[PDB]
Amino acid sequence: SMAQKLNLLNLAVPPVTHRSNFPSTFTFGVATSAYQIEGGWNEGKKGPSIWDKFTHIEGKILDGSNGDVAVDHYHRYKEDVDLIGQLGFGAYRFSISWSRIFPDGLGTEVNEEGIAFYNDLINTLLEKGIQPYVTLYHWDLPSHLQEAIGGWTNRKIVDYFGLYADACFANFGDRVKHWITLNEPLQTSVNGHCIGIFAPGRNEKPLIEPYLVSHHQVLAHATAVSIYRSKYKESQGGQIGLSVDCEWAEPNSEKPEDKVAADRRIDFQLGWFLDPLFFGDYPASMRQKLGDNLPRFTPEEKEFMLQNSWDFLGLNHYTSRLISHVSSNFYQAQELERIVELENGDLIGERAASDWLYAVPWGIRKTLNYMSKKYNHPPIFITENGMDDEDDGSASIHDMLDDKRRVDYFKSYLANVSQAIEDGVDIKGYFAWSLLDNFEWAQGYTKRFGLVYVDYKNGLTRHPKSSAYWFMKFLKG
Structure with a gap:
């Protein structure tokens, strides 16, 4: 049965990990993002972003909070x-x-x-x-681009992103040697422009705008790679990539249509962005189903993308689903259902605070092997992996600090990352999400992802959690 199959999958890679299980040159890091931690939203002549505008509208954020101060990393x-x-x-x-x-x-x-x-x-x-x-x-x-040209829906966004990328390479690339162009373009297209729960909050043209936004994000990434390779890489010697999220898709049965559906589920997540760069066009499963609403690349754009794909792939990975074929129109076009319950009633993993985040450690190893086989064994970084605790403002600080479940999450997923290296995946490093608790988008501060606690009640004090001290001991070896 599938219950037995998955139980054997978990038992084959026990949740034990040590620094010696990874190459000596492996890079271990932590990850944040600017809006989620910086604050200083109107300081230093900074212009407003679409998230400044979005969080200032009552009702968009679960707890009515914003990133005006966040955790004040700016100071x-x-x-x-x-x-x-x-x-x-x-x-x-x-x-x-x-x-x-x-x-x-x-x-x-x-x-x-x-x-x-x-x-x-x-x-x-x-x-x-x-x-x-x-x-x-x-x-x-920047909110001015959203207001003036429609943001990512307008092809000109590619050229504004190019100017921004160029300025960053010119100012910082003597000291920054690893660049990530875009983070999770899937979320910007779908949550930003299909259902509108992320800035800029658009849901007015769901059959059209998500695909324009992905089209232009893909072209913007290729443009930044082209700028970096042609102007800066020779003297600076760094590497450029992008970070894409993927929820692993495991067939819910051995039925052929469930394997086809799982492959389609990955196509719509990963292939949407990577296949234009690597093969020169969108996945055929997307073309077949979406027809004229999926834009077409010109021959010049295909040649451009093929020459400017990536130096490395960054994988953002949190969770997995069983997938059943079933004959958000983005989600409806996939003709499938996402499943967490086996038929015996058990779940494929324990849920964290986020309603979508089920801890399924074997899924990160499946994702890594899939990417390495599909895209010709590229260098891969896990650029995000982690889990959240729930705190609506009433949770005990001591319960938030004794985060045994987070420790278990990192032990069990890292054991699978180690195994994917043994499987032959060229994994270069791993970044925990996140260094510290921060503003989790439409959830506000209610989801704590940090290795380090941030006291929103008293001075934004940092308190490392049990998971921080575990990483400290793990990294010392």
Whole structure:
């Protein structure tokens, strides 16, 4: 039965892991994003982003909160960098706020106060021996671009992103050697423009706008890679990639249509963005089903993407589903159902605070092997993996700090990452989401993903959790 099959999958990779299970050169890091931690939303001449606008509308955010202050990393980054070093991480994945560099997004007048902030952050990281891994776009589009051209729905967004990428490479690439163009373009297209629960909150054209937005994100990524390779890589010597999320898709049965449905489920998540770059077009399963609503690339665009795919792939991975064929129109076009309950009543994994996040450790190994086989064994980083606790404002601080379930999550997934290396996946590193509790988008502060607790009641004090001390001991080996 499938219950037995999955039980054997978990037993084959016990939740035990040590630093020696990973290559000596493997990179361990923690990850954040600018809107979720920085605060200082109107300081240093920063322009407003679509998330500044979105969180200022009552009803968009579960707890009525916003990222105006967040965890005040904008003012406290030196102490946050110290903490990364003390926990023992060798790298730090963070994002640059586009509207700190070009407050209106138009790319013509660089904002020197924004450059100064990220230069000091980068220099502080390198003083402590921590490698910066920089996400250019982690969802905080300058609101002027949203208002003036329609944001990602307008092809011109590709050129504004190019100017932004170029400015970042020019100012920071002497010290930043790993670049991530976009974070989770799937979420921006679908949650941002189909159902509208993420900024810019659009749900008016769900059959059209999600596909325009993915089209332009793919072309924007290829443009940034092209800029980096042609202008900066020769002298700077770094690498550029993108971070895509994928919920693993395991067939719910041995029926052939369930395997086809699981393959389709991955096509609509990963292939939507990676197949244009690697094969020159969208997945055939998307073309067949979506018809004219999926834009077509010109021959010049196909040649451009094929020459500018990636140096590495960044995988954001949290969870898995069983998949059954079943004959959000994005979700309806996939003709399937996502399943967490086996027929004997048990779940494929324990749920975390987020309603979608089930802890299924064997799923990260399946995802890694799938990506390596499909895309010709590229270098892969896990750029996000982690889990959240629930805190509506009434949870005990001591319950939030004794985060045994998070420890178990990291032990069990890391054991599977180690095994995927043994399987032959060229995994170069792993980033825990997140260094510290922060603003979790439409959930507000109610979901705590940090290794480090942040006291929203008293001065945004940082308190490392049990999972932070586990990572400290793990990383010392």
